[PDB]
# Entry
Amino acid sequence: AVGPFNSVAEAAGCVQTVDWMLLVLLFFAVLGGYHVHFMLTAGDWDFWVDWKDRRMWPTVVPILGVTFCAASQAFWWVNFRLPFGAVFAALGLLIGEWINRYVNFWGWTYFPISLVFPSALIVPAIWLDVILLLSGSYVITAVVGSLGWGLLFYPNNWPAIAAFHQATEQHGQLMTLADLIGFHFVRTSMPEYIRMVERGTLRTFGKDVVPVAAFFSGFVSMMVYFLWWFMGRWYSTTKVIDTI
Amino acid sequence: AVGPFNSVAEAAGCVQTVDWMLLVLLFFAVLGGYHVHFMLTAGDWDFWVDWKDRRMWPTVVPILGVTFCAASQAFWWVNFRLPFGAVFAALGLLIGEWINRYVNFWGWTYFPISLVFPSALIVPAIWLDVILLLSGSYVITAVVGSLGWGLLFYPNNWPAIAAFHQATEQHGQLMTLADLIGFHFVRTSMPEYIRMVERGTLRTFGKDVVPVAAFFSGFVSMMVYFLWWFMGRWYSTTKVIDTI
Amino acid sequence: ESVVDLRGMWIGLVLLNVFYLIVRIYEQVFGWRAGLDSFAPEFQTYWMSILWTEIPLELVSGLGLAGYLWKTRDRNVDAVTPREEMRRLVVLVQWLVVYGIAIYWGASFFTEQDGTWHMTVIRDTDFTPSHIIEFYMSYPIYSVIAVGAFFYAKTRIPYFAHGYSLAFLIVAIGPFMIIPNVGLFGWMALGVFGVVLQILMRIHALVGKEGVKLLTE
Amino acid sequence: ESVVDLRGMWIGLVLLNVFYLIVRIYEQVFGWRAGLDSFAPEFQTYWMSILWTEIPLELVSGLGLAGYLWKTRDRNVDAVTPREEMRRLVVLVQWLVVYGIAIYWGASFFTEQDGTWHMTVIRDTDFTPSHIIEFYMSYPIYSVIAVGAFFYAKTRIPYFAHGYSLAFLIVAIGPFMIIPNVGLFGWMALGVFGVVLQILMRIHALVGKEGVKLLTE
Amino acid sequence: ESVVDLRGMWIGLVLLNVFYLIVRIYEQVFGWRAGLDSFAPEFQTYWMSILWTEIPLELVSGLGLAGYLWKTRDRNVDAVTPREEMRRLVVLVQWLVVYGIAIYWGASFFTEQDGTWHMTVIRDTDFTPSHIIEFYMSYPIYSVIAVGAFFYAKTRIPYFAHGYSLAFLIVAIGPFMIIPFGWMALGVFGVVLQILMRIHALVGKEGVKLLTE
Amino acid sequence: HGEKSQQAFLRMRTLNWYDVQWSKTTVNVNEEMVLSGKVHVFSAWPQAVANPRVSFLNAGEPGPVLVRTAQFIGEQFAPRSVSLEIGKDYAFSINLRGRRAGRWHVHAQINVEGGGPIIGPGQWIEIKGDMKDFTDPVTLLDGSTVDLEHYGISRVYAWHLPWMAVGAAWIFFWFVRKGIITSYIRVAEGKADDVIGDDDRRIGAIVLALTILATIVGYAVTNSTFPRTIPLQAG
Ligand SMILES: [Cu+2]
Ligand SMILES: [Cu+2]
Ligand SMILES: [Cu+2]
Ligand SMILES: [Cu+2]
# Structure
C-alpha cells in the first residue's frame, strides 16, 4: 500500500526508528574517534587541574578541539542541513570524558574530581554551530566561527576554574589551590616539570597572557577548521572501488 | 606464420629473449634505486657489526626495508600477477650490498667481512610475497604481510649475528666480540657515540628489548607498506602528457 | 513480513554492555590488590589469564564471523526485492549501532581509563591491567564487530556486494592501524560518515516519488 | 629481416663493464698511495686529471647522443610497419638494459663504495677519489644513457614521439635531482615501471588475437 | 558613451597615497618623541587614539562597501551589452589598481617598516606605533578594497556573478589568514586571466586577429 | 612497585639510597605518618639518563592512598622541580596523611627530567578507617579553611552539567523538528531550504544570544566570588 512498506504506519514507523539508530551509532562513532585523537594530542592539559594554565592550555585545546567539530559540521550540514555538527562532537567528547573521570579517575583510582575534570567546550561549540547556521558558509564559519571558538574558551572555562586559583600560603611559599590539589593527591608519574604550563618570559609585556593566548588560539583554529572541514568531506565519500 | 613475426619460432624466440631483457633491466633498475635509498637512510646500521643492536637496527631496517618491497610488489603483482615482487627487491639489494662489502669494504679498504656484512632480508621478503600470493590482497599483505616481515627480521638475522655477541674480557671491562671487531679494525671516522644503538633507559622493563622492537617494526611497516604500494602504482604510470 | 526487527540488536547491546560491566567490575576488584606487581603470581592467575585467553578467542571469533557471513552469502544478490533490501539495510544499520557502542567502550572508556592507571603505577611491563582490556580486548572486539558489519553488507546488499565501498573498507581496516601512532592533525576512521551516506542513498532510492516527496514533504 | 638483433646491446654491455672494471682496478692501484693527500701533486696527475677530463667529455657525449638521435629521427614515424615497430621496441628494450646496468654501477657499486672510503680518510676536499668516480663519472654516464633511451624512443616510436611519456620523462630527468637531498618516504626514479609497461602495451597490441590469446593461451 | 573613464581610479589613488603620506609624516613626528613609552599618557592621545578609531571605522567602511555594492547590484546581469560589459571590466581593472597599491603600502612599506622599529624599541606591548599602522590600518584597508573589487565584479559581471571565481575568492579572503615554502595571495594571476578572457571574447575576429595581428 | 623490571645497572648507578625510615607502619584515616631518608647522587652518571639537573621527589604509591601534606629535599620545601648535583647526597622527607583503608607498599621516589622514575625502598603501610571520614583541610590567604577532598567540585558540576544538558537540548531539538532521513532526502532532492531558512535562523540567533549572555553573567558572578586569584605557580 506504499511499497516496500505495507502501511503508511509501517513506513513512518521504520523511518523514525532508523532516525534513532543512526543518530546513536553516529553519536559514538565520532565520540570514539574524537576522544582518542584529542586525548592523545591535547592530553594532559585536559586531565589535570594543574595543567590548566593561562598560556598553553587555552591555546592547544581550542586548536586540537576544533578538529572534529569542523569534520562533524562538514558532515551534518552539507548532507542534512542540520546545524548541530560542532555540538554533536563537543558534547560527544565531554560525556566520553566525564564518564571516565567519574567512573575511573575517581571511581577506580580515587583522584578528586577537582583534580581530574575536563575543559569546557559546549559554549564555543554553540558559537561555531550558529555561525554556520546564520551564514550558510563554511568559509565564514572557518573565519568568524573559529575565531569565536577560540576567544570564548577561557571565558567559558573561568566559572569552573576561578575557584582553584585562590591563593594559599604553604611552608612560606605561595600556591594556588590547584597546584596543591595536584601536589596532595599523589600521581605516581607526574613530576611538576613535565607540566607545560606558563613559566614566564622576558618577552611577556603585561598582563596580557590570556587574551593573546585566546586570539592566537582563534587565528590558528581557522586553518585547522578548513583542513578538517575538507577532511570531513573526504570522510563522507561514497566512492566505491573495484579491487584490493 | 604470425606477422610481424615470420615463423612461430621467430615469435616464441623473440618473446623469450625480451622476457630476459626485461627481468634483467628491471632487476637493476630497482636494485640501484633501492640501494641508494636504503643506504642513505638505514645506513650505517647495515655497514657495521657494532651497530646491529637490539633496539635501533631491528627497528629502522624493517621499516626502511619494506619500502621497495611494497613498491616492487605493486608493480609485479598488479600487472603480471607474478608473486615475487618483494623478493625481486630484497635480493636485489643484498647482491648489490654483498658485492660491495666484498669488492670494496674488504677488497679495497680491508675491513673484515665480519665487520661489514649486511642485514638478512630474504626470509621476511618471502613471507611478504607469499602473503600476497595466498590472499590476493595488498590490503591483507599490508597488515599480516608487513607484521610478519617485521617480526621475522631479528630471528632471521640471529644465525649470522649470535657468533659475535659472545663475551670477552678486555682490560677489566666486558665487551661483545662485535664491539671489539669495531674497536680493532680502525675506522677513520666512526667514534663509538655516533652509533645509535641501545644504551638503556629507565622505562625498559625486562628482558623485552627485541620483542617490542620487532612488534613496533611490524606495526609501522604497515603504514610504510601502504604508502609505497600506491607509490609503486604511481610509478607504474603510463600517462602521456602534452607539453613541458 | 516486517522490515524492522531489532531483536538481534538488543541481543548485541545487552550481551555487550553486560560483558564490559562485568569486566569493569572485575577490574575494580582485581585491579586493586592483584594487578600491581606483575612479578607476583597473583598476576598470572587474575590478569595474564585474560590476555592468553582472549587473543586466540578473538582471532577465532573474528574469522568465524567472517567465514560464516561469506558462507551464508546471498548468491543471487541482485535479485533482492525492495522490501528484503529494506529489511537487509535495517539489519546493517543494526550492525552499525553495535559497532557504534563497541567503539565507545574500546576507544573512549577503556582508552582514557589507561590514563588514570598510568598515574597509579610506575610500570612492570606493557601488560598492565588496563593494557590487557584496552589493547588486547576492547579494541579487537570492536574490530571484530566492524569486519562483521562490513562482511554482512558485502554479502547481503547489492551495492556493497560487487564493489568495496571505500568508506566501509577504511572503517573495517583502520582498526589494524591504531597500534602505530602510537604505543597508545591525524589519520582516523570517521569512515562511518561514508557508510551511513551509502546506506542513506539506498533508502532514498527504495521509495518512489510516492514515499519520497509526498509522504515526507 | 630480423626483429631481434642484440649485437648493439652487447657492444654497450661489454664496452661498459670493461670500462668500470678498468676504473675499479685503477682506483685499487691509485686510490691506495696516490689519492690520500689531495694537496700532494700526485693527486693532480692521477685523480684531478679524470675530473677535468670527464666532465666536458660527458657533456659533449651527452649532447652528441641527443642531437644525433634527433637528427636521424624518423620523420614519417606514424607509417612504421608492425615488423619495424617491433624491431624498434626491441632496440628500446636494449637501451634500457644498458641503462639498467649503468644504473647498477653508478647507484649501487660506486655509491656504496664511497661509504667505505669515508672510513679511510678524514677528508681534504669533496673531490676525493670516490667522489670523482661516483658523482662526476658513474652518475653522469648513466644519465647520458638515460637521455639516449629517451630520445631514441621519442624519435623512433609512434607513442613516445608526439607525447612525452610521463614515466620516461621522469626517468630521464630525475637524474638531475640526485645532487640535492643530500648534497653528498622519498623521491625516486623507478619510473622504468611505467616505461616497460608502455613498452609492454605496444607489444600486446602488435600481435593480433592470433599471437595473443592463441599462441600464448 | 566612453568605455574608459579612470576618473574614479585617480580619486582612489590620490585619496590613498595622500592619506599614507600624511600617516608616514605623522609617524615621523610622533613616532619620535610620543611613541616610545606606551605607559606614558602621550601614548594614549597620539597612538592609542588611532587604534580605537580605525577598527570600528574600518569595520563599517568594510560592510558599507559590501552592502552597498550588493544593493546596487545589476539584477538583470546576463543582459549586459558588449560595450557596457567592457566598461564594467575597465572599472574592475580600476578596482584592482587601487587594490594593487593598497597592497604595496600595507604589505611592503608599513610591513618592512616594523622591522626597523623593532630595532628602535625593546617593547612595551604589541600596540607599538608601527603595529597600529601595519596590522590595524594598512592591512585592514587593503582588505576592504579587496572585498570591494570582489563584490563589484560579483554584482556587475556575468561570469563573476553566478560562480565565485576561485582566484578571486582566495584574493578577497586570504587577507583574513595573514594574522597566522608558503601560502600566499598572488590570486590576482587568476583574476586578471579571468578579466583577459572576457576581453578576448568581447572582440569579434574583427578586433582580435585583424586589428591586432 | 615495578623496580624489579627496570634495568639493573641503571638502578645501581644513579641514585644511592640510605637510612630510609617510616614514621609509623600503621595509620588511621587522617593520621599523619612520615617517610624520610637520604640519597647519594652517583658520580659517574649513566649516558642513558638525563643529567639530574631537573628532578622531582615523590611518594611511590598506588594513587592517593595517602595525601601528601608536604615534602622536603636538600633542605627545601619541594612541591616543584629541583636540581641534584652529581656526586652529592641530599636528605629528604615526605609528610603523608592516610586516606584510603588497606595495606599499601609506599616508596621514596625521584624522577629525572629526561630519565624517568627512580624508585627507592618501600614499606607496607597498613591504613585503617573509612575513607568517608578523610578530610584535608587547607587555609587560604584570606584566612578561611577548605576541605580539599571536596572543595570546588560542587561549583564545577554546577557549570558543566547545565551546559551539557543545553548541548543535548540543541541536538534533540533539530533532530525532532526535521529528521535525519527526511532532511537527507529534502537536501538530496532540490531542497534544502525547506530544512532551514529563517525563522530557523531566528531560533539560532536567539539561542546564541542567550549562550553569550549566559557566559558574561557566569563570568561576572565567578569574578565576584573569588575576586582575587593568582596564576599556577611553576618552575
Ligand atoms: Cu598504558
Ligand atoms: Cu663522500
Ligand atoms: Cu613588531
Ligand atoms: Cu613496592
The longest helix of chain C spans residues 82-118. Chain C is about 70% helix and 0% strand.
